[PDB]
Amino acid sequence: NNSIAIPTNFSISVTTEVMPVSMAKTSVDCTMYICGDSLECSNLLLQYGSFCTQLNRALSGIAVEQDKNTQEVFAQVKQMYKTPTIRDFGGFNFSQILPDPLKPTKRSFIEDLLYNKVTLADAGFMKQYADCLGGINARDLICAQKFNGLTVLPPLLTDDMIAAYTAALISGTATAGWTFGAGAALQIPFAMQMAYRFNGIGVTQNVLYENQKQIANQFNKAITQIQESLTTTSTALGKLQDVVNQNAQALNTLVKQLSSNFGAISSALNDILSRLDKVEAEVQIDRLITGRLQSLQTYVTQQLIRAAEIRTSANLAATKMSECVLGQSKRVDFCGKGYHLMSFPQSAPHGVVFLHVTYVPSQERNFTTAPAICHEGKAYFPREGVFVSNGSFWFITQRNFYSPQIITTDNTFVAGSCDVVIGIINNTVYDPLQP
Amino acid sequence: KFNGLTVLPPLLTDDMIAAYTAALISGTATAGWTFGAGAALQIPFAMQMAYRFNGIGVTQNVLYENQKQIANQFNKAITQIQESLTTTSTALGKLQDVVNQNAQALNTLVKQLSSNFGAISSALNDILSRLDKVEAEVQIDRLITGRLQSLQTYVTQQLIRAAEIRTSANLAATKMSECVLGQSKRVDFCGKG
Amino acid sequence: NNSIAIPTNFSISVTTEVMPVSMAKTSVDCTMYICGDSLECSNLLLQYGSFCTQLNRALSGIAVEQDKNTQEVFAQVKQMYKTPTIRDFGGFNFSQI
Amino acid sequence: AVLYQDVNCTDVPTTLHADQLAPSWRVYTTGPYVFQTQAGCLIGAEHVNASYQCDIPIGAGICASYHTQKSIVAYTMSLGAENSVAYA
Numbered sequence: 001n002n003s004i005a006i007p008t009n010f011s012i013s014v015t016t017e018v019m020p021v022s023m024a025k026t027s028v029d030c031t032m033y034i035c036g037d038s039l040e041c042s043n044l045l046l047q048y049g050s051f052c053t054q055l056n057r058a059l060s061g062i063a064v065e066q067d068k069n070t071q072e073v074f075a076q077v078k079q080m081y082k083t084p085t086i087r088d089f090g091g092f093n094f095s096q097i098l099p100d101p102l103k104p105t106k107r108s109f110i111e112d113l114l115y116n117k118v119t120l121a122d123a124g125f126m127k128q129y130a131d132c133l134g135g136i137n138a139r140d141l142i143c144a145q146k147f148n149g150l151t152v153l154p155p156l157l158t159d160d161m162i163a164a165y166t167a168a169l170i171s172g173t174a175t176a177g178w179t180f181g182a183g184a185a186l187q188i189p190f191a192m193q194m195a196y197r198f199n200g201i202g203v204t205q206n207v208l209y210e211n212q213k214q215i216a217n218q219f220n221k222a223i224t225q226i227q228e229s230l231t232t233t234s235t236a237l238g239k240l241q242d243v244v245n246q247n248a249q250a251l252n253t254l255v256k257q258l259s260s261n262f263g264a265i266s267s268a269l270n271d272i273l274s275r276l277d278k279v280e281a282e283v284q285i286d287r288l289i290t291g292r293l294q295s296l297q298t299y300v301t302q303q304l305i306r307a308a309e310i311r312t313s314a315n316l317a318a319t320k321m322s323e324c325v326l327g328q329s330k331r332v333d334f335c336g337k338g339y340h341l342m343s344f345p346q347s348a349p350h351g352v353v354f355l356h357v358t359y360v361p362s363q364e365r366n367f368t369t370a371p372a373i374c375h376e377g378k379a380y381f382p383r384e385g386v387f388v389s390n391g392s393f394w395f396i397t398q399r400n401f402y403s404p405q406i407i408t409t410d411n412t413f414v415a416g417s418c419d420v421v422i423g424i425i426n427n428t429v430y431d432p433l434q435p
Numbered sequence: 436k437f438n439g440l441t442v443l444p445p446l447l448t449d450d451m452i453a454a455y456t457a458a459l460i461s462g463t464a465t466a467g468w469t470f471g472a473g474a475a476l477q478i479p480f481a482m483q484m485a486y487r488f489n490g491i492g493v494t495q496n497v498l499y500e501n502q503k504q505i506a507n508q509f510n511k512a513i514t515q516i517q518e519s520l521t522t523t524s525t526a527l528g529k530l531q532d533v534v535n536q537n538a539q540a541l542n543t544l545v546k547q548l549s550s551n552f553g554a555i556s557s558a559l560n561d562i563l564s565r566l567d568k569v570e571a572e573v574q575i576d577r578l579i580t581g582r583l584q585s586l587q588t589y590v591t592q593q594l595i596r597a598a599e600i601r602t603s604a605n606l607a608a609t610k611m612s613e614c615v616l617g618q619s620k621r622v623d624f625c626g627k628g
Numbered sequence: 629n630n631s632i633a634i635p636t637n638f639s640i641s642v643t644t645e646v647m648p649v650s651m652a653k654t655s656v657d658c659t660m661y662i663c664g665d666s667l668e669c670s671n672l673l674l675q676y677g678s679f680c681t682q683l684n685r686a687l688s689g690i691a692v693e694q695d696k697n698t699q700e701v702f703a704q705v706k707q708m709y710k711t712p713t714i715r716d717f718g719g720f721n722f723s724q725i
Numbered sequence: 726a727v728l729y730q731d732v733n734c735t736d737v738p739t740t741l742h743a744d745q746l747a748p749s750w751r752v753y754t755t756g757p758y759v760f761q762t763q764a765g766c767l768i769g770a771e772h773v774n775a776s777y778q779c780d781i782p783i784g785a786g787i788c789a790s791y792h793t794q795k796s797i798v799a800y801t802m803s804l805g806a807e808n809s810v811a812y813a
């Protein structure tokens with residue numbers, strides 16, 4: 001009942017958070033999947049003609065929404081701030097977060113490391129139609145998907161525009177701070193921004209200016225540690241990989257489901273129309289059509305459910321960008337484990353990777369405390385901080401750093417009569433006015 | 436179980452969940468709000484409640500002059516909460532509905548096996564023991580195509596229910612992270628006041 | 629324009645909030661449900677063989693999710709603080725929880 | 726205007742079989758109004774060097790519109806106004 005632990009040192013930690021934003025936009029042609037380029041089948045599909053656009057009114061409703069998830073996340077600023085020529089903002093090294101002007105690439109080092117980790121060459125994201133016509137490439141899965149009228153529409157924003165958005169966001173964070181989300185950007189030196197961000201945690205601003213070099217070294221070491229950890233590992237972006245794998249396996253299942261005959265005598269339209277006359281060939285083709293509509297229906301339903309899940313993740317990403325980047329958040333364990341300082345967004349294939357910078361106290365110490373001190377019959381309570389004892393003296397400190405101060409009347413406020421407070425002690429309060 | 440519809444057990448038992456709950460409550464009581472950031476820091480409960488009072492707008496001299504009244508009010512509120520869970524009968528209706536929906540869906544999936552889907556019978560034994568193999572394949576395939584639809588509908592409805600349960604689980608995780616491991620300033624998020 | 633109401637007393641209230649977290653995980657066997665333990669039916673189900681694993685890739689996708697929904701809610705601490713031997717934390721009674 | 730998915734502008738009439746098409750279709754397989762994007766050959770709209778907002782999105786950072794006789798133009802979408810902040 002009279003013991004308290006007060007930290008004496010701290011640490012700065014940079015953590016990763018990977019969230020998907022969008023999936024692959026897909027379009028489906030009813031003809032060349034149900035009726036394989038045959039005139040006899042296309043004369044029978046018209047009776048099901050209202051059952052097809054209902055698919056194309058759904059798959060085209062997801063895809064435009066897939067271009068709304070990205071621009072809600074990244075395009076949160078109406079100004080494109082240019083990247084500064086320097087990367088040393090008072091000891092804080094921003095070299096590997098911002099793009100390098102002396103390189104042909106428009107993406108930074110960590111952005112380059114996030115790429116070439118997601119194997120995008122498993123689906124039909126980049127596949128020309130020239131090599132699909134001839135050669136052994138006709139045995140590929142993508143060639144069959146294209147020959148069966150299943151394409152993948154390209155995204156609106158390229159990777160260069162998203163990289164420019166992230167570079168503008170990081171430049172606005174470095175040169176302006178929290179004030180470029182409200183109105184016009186207001187310049188401020190980065191040490192003052194760090195001091196103000198420290199003052200919103202419970203640590204007074206004199207702590208930063210007495211430990212600027214140590215904090216700069218810790219930040220640089222943490223950035224170098226997270227940068228090296230993205231090369232040795234093999235599984236760190238499994239969330240973004242699962243989306244590509246799921247879409248590719250769903251399209252492959254939809255392609256491979258054409259080998260089922262659905263109760264007919266054959267699974268192809270060519271050996272049915274070349275064996276049976278038109279009297280009884282219409283009762284086997286219709287079974288195939290009614291069976292091949294169900295595969296498209298199931299694919300559309302599963303795509304809609306996955307689109308809803310991806311939209312939920314994109315809304316969470318947009319909220320995290322609006323709250324944990326453009327300002328400082330007081331929500332516990334929202335961005336990063338601990339006391340949040342600031343965050344940096346990095347692009348990834350169909351996803352966003354957040355680097356959260358967090359403050360954690362490290363080394364504790366036992367202490368004996370007291371709820372209040374009464375001097376001459378009147379109780380004194382601490383204004384900001386707690387009363388503490390080092391063994392022989394009584395001081396008043398802050399709750400997140402051991403910085404002892406002499407108990408005066410400028411840091412205490414008076415109340416009570418010390419007959420009602422439980423645990424009150426006897427001590428003297430220094431008066432700074434004596435002639 | 437005779438139709439191949441089983442329910443798998445959960446990974447976490449009730450004892451482990453109760454241990455997690457007891458650990459969270461003990462960490463809140465002894466350490467406070469500081470065990471969700473880093474290492475747990477001990478502090479007396481009176482000073483912790485004084486600091487939590489200071490986050491509202493009420494100064495900390497109010498609690499130390501009224502500690503017994505606040506303690507008695509908290510104890511009476513806890514007692515009134517405990518007795519209100521014995522007399523009532525409809526207070527966990529959400530979880531009861533969650534259980535009942537799954538049970539009713541599985542029962543409906545079992546009972547949907549009595550439809551012949553246009554065939555001459557709803558069972559595979561009086562179809563294969565009357566008609567020869569020439570014309571029995573046109574009736575069994577109707578039953579198979581009919582019985583795939585029931586599984587498809589069941590899987591789709593289970594997916595939708597799983598999506599809404601995942602949304603509620605994310606809300607519960609946010610409530611546990613923001614209100615148990617600290618004190619939130621969001622109006623009407625956890626509590627009323 | 630010159631009147632204000634200020635409280636003079638307070639009260640401490642406890643409010644319960646119930647929330648579902650997980651539901652019942654389910655597995656479905658294709659061959660037992662569709663074909664009533666008969667060899668003639670199972671010889672025709674093979675042509676529908678791609679339609680069944682797609683079912684078992686969905687329900688099994690739900691169940692492994694339901695073991696996560698719990699661990700996101702309750703498993704938010706990496707340390708097991710033992711319950712103290714006392715239940716009187718400065719007058720506040722913790723004996724029920 | 727007509728956009729072909731993932732083809733080259735030289736191979737448009739070969740992969741569309743322009744000999745068997747209608748005479749009105751053959752004007753959309755070649756001509757002076759040909760643009761090459763990362764999504765494929767866009768035939769029907771002229772390309773301009775200006776940058777505006779997006780009206781009809783195509784893909785790979787290309788947006789078409791109906792500007793001034795009037796005709797369909799194509800360009801690259803503008804992300805925003807370029808700005809600079811003096812830091813010291």
Ligand SMILES: *[C@@H]1O[C@H](CO)[C@@H](O[C@@H]2O[C@H](CO)[C@@H](O)[C@H](O)[C@H]2NC(C)=O)[C@H](O)[C@H]1NC(C)=O
Binds near residue numbers: 009010214
């Ligand atoms: C907190 O810990 C850091 C190390 O994480 C200490 O930083 C050292 O400070 C001394 C001078 O005080 C320097 O000579 C060292 O180079 C610093 N680094 C290391 C790695 O030792 C810091 O002093 C600690 N603060 C305390 C104990 O109050």
Ligand SMILES: *[C@@H]1O[C@H](CO)[C@@H](O[C@@H]2O[C@H](CO)[C@@H](O)[C@H](O)[C@H]2NC(C)=O)[C@H](O)[C@H]1NC(C)=O
Binds near residue numbers: 424425426
């Ligand atoms: C703290 O100081 C007060 C005020 O002096 C003490 O209360 C009385 O002190 C006088 C001497 O000043 C003693 O003769 C009385 O016996 C004290 N009365 C009581 C009821 O204690 C008080 O004892 C001091 N110590 C503490 C722990 O409160």
Ligand SMILES: *[C@@H]1O[C@H](CO)[C@@H](O[C@@H]2O[C@H](CO)[C@@H](O)[C@H](O)[C@H]2NC(C)=O)[C@H](O)[C@H]1NC(C)=O
Binds near residue numbers: 504636637638
């Ligand atoms: C606020 O209301 C409570 C009752 O809800 C009052 O508490 C009483 O306080 C007196 C001393 O002030 C004690 O002797 C009583 O035992 C308390 N309880 C009851 C049930 O009477 C409290 O005084 C009120 N505060 C005000 C009016 O300022």
Ligand SMILES: *[C@@H]1O[C@H](CO)[C@@H](O[C@@H]2O[C@H](CO)[C@@H](O)[C@H](O)[C@H]2NC(C)=O)[C@H](O)[C@H]1NC(C)=O
Binds near residue numbers: 811
């Ligand atoms: C004074 O404030 C202005 C406006 O906030 C700053 O902005 C512009 O800076 C550029 C580059 O130096 C100048 O060419 C412009 O004339 C400035 N004004 C406007 C309205 O565009 C300016 O940098 C600030 N002054 C200094 C010396 O930093």
Ligand SMILES: *[C@@H]1O[C@H](CO)[C@@H](O)[C@H](O)[C@H]1NC(C)=O
Binds near residue numbers: 087088093095096
């Ligand atoms: C910042 O980091 C880069 C890359 O590691 C390094 O070359 C440079 O010396 C560091 N410091 C400054 C002040 O740019």
Ligand SMILES: *[C@@H]1O[C@H](CO)[C@@H](O)[C@H](O)[C@H]1NC(C)=O
Binds near residue numbers: 001002
């Ligand atoms: C703290 O608790 C101990 C053990 O019960 C007791 O002796 C002591 O008086 C208490 N101190 C205060 C200030 O309540």
Ligand SMILES: *[C@@H]1O[C@H](CO)[C@@H](O)[C@H](O)[C@H]1NC(C)=O
Binds near residue numbers: 715716721722
């Ligand atoms: C706390 O509540 C329990 C259960 O009603 C009771 O037995 C006990 O006396 C109360 N007080 C203390 C100080 O434990």
Ligand SMILES: *[C@@H]1O[C@H](CO)[C@@H](O)[C@H](O)[C@H]1NC(C)=O
Binds near residue numbers: 130733
């Ligand atoms: C199509 O054009 C691109 C870009 O010029 C070129 O790299 C590619 O080789 C061309 N394809 C063919 C088949 O000529």
Ligand SMILES: *[C@@H]1O[C@H](CO)[C@@H](O)[C@H](O)[C@H]1NC(C)=O
Binds near residue numbers: 773
């Ligand atoms: C548009 O830009 C291209 C590429 O630089 C150039 O060849 C062309 O002349 C420009 N057209 C104009 C300015 O009308």
